[PDB]
Amino acid sequence: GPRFLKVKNWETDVVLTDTLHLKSTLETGCTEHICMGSIMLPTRKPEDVRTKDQLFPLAKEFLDQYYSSIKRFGSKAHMDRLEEVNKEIESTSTYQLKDTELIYGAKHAWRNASRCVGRIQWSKLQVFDARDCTTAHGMFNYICNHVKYATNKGNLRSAITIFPQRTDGKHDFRVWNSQLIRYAGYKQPDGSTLGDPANVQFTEICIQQGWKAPRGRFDVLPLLLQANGNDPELFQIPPELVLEVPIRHPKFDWFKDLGLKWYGLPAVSNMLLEIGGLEFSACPFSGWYMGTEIGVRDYCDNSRYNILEEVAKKMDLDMRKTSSLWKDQALVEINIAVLYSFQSDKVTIVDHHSATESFIKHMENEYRCRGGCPADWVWIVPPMSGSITPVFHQEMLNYRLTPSFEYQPDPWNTHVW
Amino acid sequence: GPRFLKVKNWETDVVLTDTLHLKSTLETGCTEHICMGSIMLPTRKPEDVRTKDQLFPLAKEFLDQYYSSIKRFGSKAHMDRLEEVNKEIESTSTYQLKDTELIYGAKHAWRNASRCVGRIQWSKLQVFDARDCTTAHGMFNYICNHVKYATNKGNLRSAITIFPQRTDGKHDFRVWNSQLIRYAGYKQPDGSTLGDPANVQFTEICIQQGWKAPRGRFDVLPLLLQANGNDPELFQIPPELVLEVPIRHPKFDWFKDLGLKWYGLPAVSNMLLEIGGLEFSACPFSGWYMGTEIGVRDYCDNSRYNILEEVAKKMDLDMRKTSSLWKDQALVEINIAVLYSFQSDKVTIVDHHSATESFIKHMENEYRCRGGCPADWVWIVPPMSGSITPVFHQEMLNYRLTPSFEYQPDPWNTHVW
Ligand code: HEM
Ligand code: HEM
Ligand SMILES: C[C@H](O)[C@H](O)[C@H]1CNc2nc(N)[nH]c(=O)c2N1
Numbered sequence A, B: 001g002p003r004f005l006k007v008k009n010w011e012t013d014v015v016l017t018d019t020l021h022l023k024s025t026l027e028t029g030c031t032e033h034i035c036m037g038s039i040m041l042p043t044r045k046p047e048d049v050r051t052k053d054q055l056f057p058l059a060k061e062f063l064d065q066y067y068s069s070i071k072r073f074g075s076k077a078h079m080d081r082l083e084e085v086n087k088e089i090e091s092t093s094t095y096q097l098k099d100t101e102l103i104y105g106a107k108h109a110w111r112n113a114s115r116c117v118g119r120i121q122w123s124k125l126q127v128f129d130a131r132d133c134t135t136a137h138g139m140f141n142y143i144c145n146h147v148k149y150a151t152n153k154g155n156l157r158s159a160i161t162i163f164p165q166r167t168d169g170k171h172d173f174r175v176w177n178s179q180l181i182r183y184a185g186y187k188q189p190d191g192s193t194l195g196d197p198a199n200v201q202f203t204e205i206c207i208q209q210g211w212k213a214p215r216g217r218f219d220v221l222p223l224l225l226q227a228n229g230n231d232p233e234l235f236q237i238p239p240e241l242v243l244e245v246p247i248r249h250p251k252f253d254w255f256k257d258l259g260l261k262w263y264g265l266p267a268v269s270n271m272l273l274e275i276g277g278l279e280f281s282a283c284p285f286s287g288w289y290m291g292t293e294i295g296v297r298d299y300c301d302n303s304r305y306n307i308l309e310e311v312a313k314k315m316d317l318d319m320r321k322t323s324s325l326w327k328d329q330a331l332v333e334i335n336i337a338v339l340y341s342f343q344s345d346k347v348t349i350v351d352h353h354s355a356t357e358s359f360i361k362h363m364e365n366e367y368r369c370r371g372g373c374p375a376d377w378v379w380i381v382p383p384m385s386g387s388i389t390p391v392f393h394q395e396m397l398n399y400r401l402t403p404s405f406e407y408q409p410d411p412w413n414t415h416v417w
């Protein structure tokens, strides 16, 4: 309250002192009188994007941070690089990051992702430099290697692939897909929706672009890639590269008849990675699933597959009134299966209990070595059984540190010719 | 973003415009660069409490609000009351609220409780004026009537009992208990803890004050009441007034052997109610339980009864690794029983599904008639199955409106003689 902020865990009484929040460079969207802590989404006006004049301050901020990290703040190399980048900016209206800085930048962007519970792994990130890429077909190749390297035959590995930074002319690179691997969604005029409802619009775009949709329940969508600002091009991901897992239950043999399956590689590909002021509008990244993402959100959200109803009658659950908590029951079994299935097929996965416990272990390490750890409680607490996971009882300070990942508008909303 | 704030429901796409946040008078604890949205707890320095000079502005703020509510802002009655209260304050260094203002004040304090999911009922509040009370025995009688009126033989009714306001000498009134009805907690030097661990310290205080503890698992604690600032006095609540419910399962007949029971009346009694600047440090209030409060928090929290383990072996659940989600399974059954039991015993209760659905219906009504509804997502989303309740997907603006309920320090931490 007075000087430095404290966070307490109401299950263990542990109190931690936070000093890192003072490093905040971005705004939370909150004010002294309002809290937007549960708000999902808290170009430009002058130029189409950032400006050469405002770039160097942001570059200096990162470099200074960078050289401090390696304990060489104010050294020749540090002072030299600074002048060096100052020159590049004046000359070209931008600058290129060294390989080592790009790696530090990406890892720390992950370390600063307040909404990610899997941050105990932030330092094992494998960075793939795709800054020399120039065409969509080029992007496709870099993405295929990512998936193959990341999937690693079920023994998942964290990785991110960074494409060319945004500029002032050559346009930018974008993976139009929200995730590298996702299923299509079809809406019959019958009101019903075959597949993922969250992907209906994107699917419609793929079909208008020539995609010959198979009209199935679990049809993997084709990559829609944009390079150097040109029209996006369709690419089928090599099915041989897409590791999938059929969902069965370790007790209910009737579960398999639901005909459920999910892909093992979660790869977010619509976010923007910012480092030293440079904007990488194409930086697909991936780690591994936490069971609830699939069992709860993907399968049970009313707006998603919404299979609770279907899974309810199968169990013969009392669906007269919610008081029977049939929904709650159907929910647990679905998540037991998802975890059981992945673990049988030897595909990397983590249950919400081990995941949250690890995040807690991470928070403490960070408070000890870094003086804090920005965390978004609303995103960190699992979408089920929140109360019985260690993070529900953990107070969390949320703030924006840089480098960082950010949201960006969907490209099809402003693409031409 | 630009002018007025918007909130969107990501499950229905519904977007609501919030204008009520501009009515914020208190601070959230958040800044443009930090979010304390998950912080539990975000006297005085000069005087022991508030001051006569700062009281009239706060009184005027409330009265103005009050007369606006009844559509008579700026009328004779309004202007007269204002001058009238201005006089009382100068003369006595405080003022007395009219009955009608106290009622409006208490109902709106509830309407403004951002952390309460049961707010669709805010207008049916029954206010019991206990401002003439002067002694602890007097408090005991007012509390017994509250419980009896509130319990209503299982057909619960919302109510609050307001004791004398804080002053500058005659000291203040406090119900030392966190809740009117709660169970004791005993800590054997064997490390084990019989009863509610959250009540161990309070229990120890009751015993030092003369309470002859029965040393049982579900021993209702004696009321510890403080009046006019005197030492607190012990009172046994009439067992005949304490409605209890034995916990059984509608399917698992072995559940009853766990020997579980809980009380049907949840009554918070350690909060402070502030209206027009007046502070009521003793205002026990009550409504009815939402199943999860008991089934999840009271029974399953590691720091509470923590009966998951015990309930695990009974079910013969696979407790080799959390991946089996045995905890999650034990959790659902426990909550099915709690709800089943209360509904069998005809004691009012609400499941998290109907509760959250009603809160959503309430938010929309408020946005329509009041222009908004402050809500604390972190408290509104249930401690289990969050994702499948409508509120998980509902963005919520949090802000502090007055009148309101506030936290206060525990009295035993500063009581003398
Ligand atoms: C190693 C395994 C990892 C696990 C288990 C993990 C887990 C999670 C979970 C459960 C979420 C919630 C996503 C949602 O609800 O939509 C999340 C969010 C996020 N994770 Fe991690 N993560 C991992 C790897 C990664 C990697 C490789 C990066 C980047 C280097 C990263 C960046 C983020 C970001 C930025 C978000 C926010 C996404 C958004 O706001 O849409 N994560 N993560
Ligand atoms: C009519 C039935 C009601 C229901 C179902 C209901 C439900 C809830 C729930 C589930 C919580 C969470 C408590 C916790 O997790 O500790 C809560 C908090 C709260 N409710 Fe309500 N409530 C009701 C009546 C009342 C009444 C009568 C008042 C006052 C007039 C009120 C004031 C509050 C306040 C101030 C909190 C916050 C308590 C704290 O921060 O410790 N509620 N309520
Ligand atoms: C740390 C965190 O704020 C704390 O555990 C909160 C979370 N949400 C809650 N929500 C409700 N209804 N009740 C609580 O006691 C809590 N505890």
Ligand SMILES: C[C@H](O)[C@H](O)[C@H]1CNc2nc(N)[nH]c(=O)c2N1
Pocket (backbone or CB within 6 Å): A038, A039, A040, A378, A379, A380, B010, B392, B393, B394, B395, B396
């Ligand atoms: C409205 C609210 O912010 C939204 O539903 C949030 C809540 N918490 C979440 N948490 C995670 N991990 N992922 C999500 O998509 C969400 N959705």
Ligand SMILES: [Zn+2]
Pocket (backbone or CB within 6 Å): A030, A034, A035, A036, A037, B030, B034, B035, B036, B037
């Ligand atoms: Zn906030």
